[PDB]
């Protein structure tokens, strides 16, 4: 239940400008993007989350007392053109750039 509303765990749409940040000469394109983020209260999984979640079960011994929190559960890539160390123009499709979904860990 991501796009933030009225206050739980949810995705907040949020635009960052590379000019604001000071990277507008290093990053050729785009000029900014909706990176987004997760806000709110916490009252498919990686292998690590999956194995640990087993020991989080009510009454389990040993017990993993994991600090639960509103984090990204889904991320998306974005293409970017930027200057490398030789100051050459490089395009890449960069993974994990955008927060697409948020959830309680």
């Amino acid at each position: 239940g991501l796009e933030c509303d009225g206050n739980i765990c949810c995705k907040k749409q949020f635009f960052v400008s590379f000019k604001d940040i000071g990277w507008n000469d290093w990053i050729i394109a785009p000029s900014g993007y909706h990176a987004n983020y997760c806000e709110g209260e916490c009252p498919s999984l990686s292998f690590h989350s999956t194995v640990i979640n087993h020991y989080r079960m009510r009454g389990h011994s040993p017990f993993a007392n994991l600090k639960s929190c509103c984090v990204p559960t889904k991320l998306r890539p974005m293409s970017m053109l930027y200057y490398d160390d030789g100051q050459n123009i490089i395009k890449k499709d960069i993974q994990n750039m955008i927060v697409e979904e948020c959830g309680c860990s």
């Binding site: 000469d25 050729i28 785009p30 974005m78 100051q87 123009i89 499709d93």
Partner: protein, 148 residues
């Protein structure tokens, strides 16, 4: 059981393979002006803008048309929209971008760089500016002022 599910604009509910209700991409393609192939910001050619909008919904939320027609090598046959201009990347693919033009002037020469063009640039910003404006990498010959 989708009667009650609402997934907002761009999306529809559809019953999946295991009977469960799922939200799937369904962008509005009902008034696309340009009917032909388009070149996405990912450097991929799409059959039309509708295919690009579905990829944007499905996989790349910031994917946009960067120019009309198929993606091209070299900037020779590329027409960039608006105030954007053409550059090529590392494998000679054309991209339409808006070049930065503002570079702070440094008060020393410690930031100086010597381009492969034999030109001394006052800073990385200055070399990057000439590069974007030229349309293709110039590249760093070595740090410091060019040696005479």
């Amino acid at each position: 059981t989708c009667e009650n599910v609402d997934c907002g604009p761009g999306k529809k509910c559809r019953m999946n393979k295991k009977n469960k209700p799922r939200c799937v991409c369904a962008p509005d393609c009902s008034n696309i002006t340009w009917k032909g192939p388009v070149c996405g910001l990912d450097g991929k050619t799409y059959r039309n803008e509708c295919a690009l909008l579905k990829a944007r919904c499905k996989e790349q939320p910031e994917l946009e048309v960067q120019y009309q027609g198929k993606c091209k090598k070299t900037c020779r046959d590329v027409f960039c929209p608006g105030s954007s201009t053409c550059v090529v990347d590392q494998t000679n693919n054309a991209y339409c971008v808006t070049c930065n033009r503002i570079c702070p002037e440094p008060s020393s020469s410690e930031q100086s760089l010597c381009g492969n063009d034999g030109v001394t640039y006052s800073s990385a910003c200055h070399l990057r500016k000439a590069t974007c404006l030229l349309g293709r990498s110039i590249g760093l010959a070595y740090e410091g002022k060019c040696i005479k």
